[PDB]
């Protein structure tokens, strides 16, 4: 039985800039069960559907997961741009899989603010699909080298969401799980019922 519980029901989620990837392999999964397993505000599949995923074995099944704010969930979709798609987590233009999200204000916000979740704000270029950038080097926005010092034109590249329970939905935390699927001339070990 595939360890989707470990992904979806994890107690803590990754910051989007350091998004987690769990490889799924050598197990049976019930994606129709997954679909109805909770209230998901987003459950969008590209090239597949839950009903049809149960019918096939796949080769490379990945579950990526992270936290972003409500207004950014739209960026976890093929062809999107924005700080999240460009500098944190980028889906390929022709992605095969499912994007699943739910509001996690009850878990990830705190009175006084959760500043534990981070996103990359400054980057000189955009991520390739499924790329991860975990560097924390000072971003040099001007012509003078920074040499590890924060200050003027020298920015720490990450910024925090400040998750407070009284935030509007657009600024409330959302947990996101991205399921990837490939069918190759390779062993296919993640199967349905």
């Amino acid at each position, epitope marked *: 039985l595939c360890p989707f519980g470990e992904v979806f029901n994890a107690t803590r989620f990754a910051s989007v800039y350091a998004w987690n990837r769990k490889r799924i392999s050598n197990c049976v999964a019930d994606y129709s069960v997954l679909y109805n397993s909770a209230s998901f505000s987003t459950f969008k599949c590209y090239g597949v559907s839950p009903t049809k995923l149960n019918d096939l074995c796949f080769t490379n099944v990945y579950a990526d997961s992270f936290v972003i704010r409500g207004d950014e969930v739209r960026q976890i979709a093929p062809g999107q741009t924005g700080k999240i798609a460009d500098y944190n987590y980028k889906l390929p233009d022709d992605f095969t899989g499912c994007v699943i999200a739910w509001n996690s204000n009850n878990l990830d916000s705190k009175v006084g603010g959760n500043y534990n979740y981070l996103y990359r704000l400054f*980057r*000189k270029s955009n991520l390739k699909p499924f790329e991860r950038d975990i560097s924390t080097e000072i971003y040099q*926005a*001007g012509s003078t080298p920074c040499n590890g010092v924060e200050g003027f*034109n020298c920015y720490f590249p990450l910024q925090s969401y400040g998750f407070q329970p009284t*935030n*509007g939905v657009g600024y409330q935390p959302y947990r996101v799980v991205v399921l990837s699927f490939e069918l190759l001339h390779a062993p296919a070990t993640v199967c349905g019922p």
Partner: single-chain antibody, 227 residues
Framework: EVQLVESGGGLIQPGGSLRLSCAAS????????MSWVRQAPGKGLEWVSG???????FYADSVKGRFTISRDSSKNTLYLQMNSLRAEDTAVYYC?????????????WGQGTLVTVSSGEIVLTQSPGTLSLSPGERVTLSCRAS???????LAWYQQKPGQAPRLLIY???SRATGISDRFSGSGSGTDFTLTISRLEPEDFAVYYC?????????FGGGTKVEI
């Protein structure tokens, strides 16, 4: 320090095209977020286009497909190519340096260049429309939002006659650098206020609020304060 200087503009025939440029000092253009903002007599202050540090570009719906924002690394210059120009594009255009929080506000502005063409957003409502007071008096300006601005992403600008806007308040209550302490912002949710405690002749200006909670960023209509 930071300097933004537009060139290009002028009088163009409807459907013509035109390129604005913005030479910047004090930061590398191709590494920062930058924007174009325009001021038309009818539509007031209006975001036009933005470019990200990594190159992604964004456009207001009214200009999408006609305008192109770009930059030249070698010249430290931001550009705005305007094609298929319409009468409604008549405006003073500002290049602006973004503070990239929420949908962004602007701590540095260019000088403004006039272009004349011949022949779901949060709405900010400003009250009142014009005030006339004497020096030393206290004034409070209202900004009401059509939706809650949940983490106080509301800025205030001062635009003196013939000048670019100048940021006074960000985060609803934080004063920008060098701003006098008799400017005071407050409020939350949908109701924000700017208070100027002892009016001085130099305070003669229009005051604009701007929400950076949601995209696109939007400005209030302005309250003119006459002294």
């Amino acid at each position: 320090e930071v300097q933004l200087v537009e060139s290009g503009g002028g009088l163009i025939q409807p459907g013509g095209s035109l390129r604005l440029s913005c030479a910047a000092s004090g930061f590398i253009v191709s590494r920062n977020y930058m924007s174009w903002v325009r001021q038309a007599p009818g539509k007031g202050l209006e975001w036009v286009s933005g470019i990200y540090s990594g190159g992604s570009t964004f456009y207001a719906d009214s200009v999408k497909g006609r305008f192109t924002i770009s930059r030249d690394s070698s010249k430290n210059t931001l550009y705005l190519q305007m094609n298929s120009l319409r009468a409604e594009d008549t405006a003073v255009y500002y290049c602006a340096k973004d503070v990239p929080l929420g949908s962004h506000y602007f701590d540095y502005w260019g000088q403004g260049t006039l272009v004349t063409v011949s022949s779901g957003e949060i709405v900010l409502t400003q009250s009142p429309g014009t005030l006339s007071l004497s020096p030393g008096e206290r004034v409070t300006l209202s900004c009401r939002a059509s939706q809650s601005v949940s983490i106080n992403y509301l800025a205030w600008y001062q635009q003196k006659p013939g000048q670019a806007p100048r940021l006074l308040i960000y985060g609803a209550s934080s004063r920008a650098t060098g701003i006098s302490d008799r400017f005071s912002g407050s409020g939350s949710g949908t109701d924000f206020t700017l208070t100027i405690s002892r009016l001085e002749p130099e305070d003669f200006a229009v005051y604009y609020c701007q929400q950076y909670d949601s995209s696109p960023l939007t400005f209030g209509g302005g309250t003119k304060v006459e002294i």
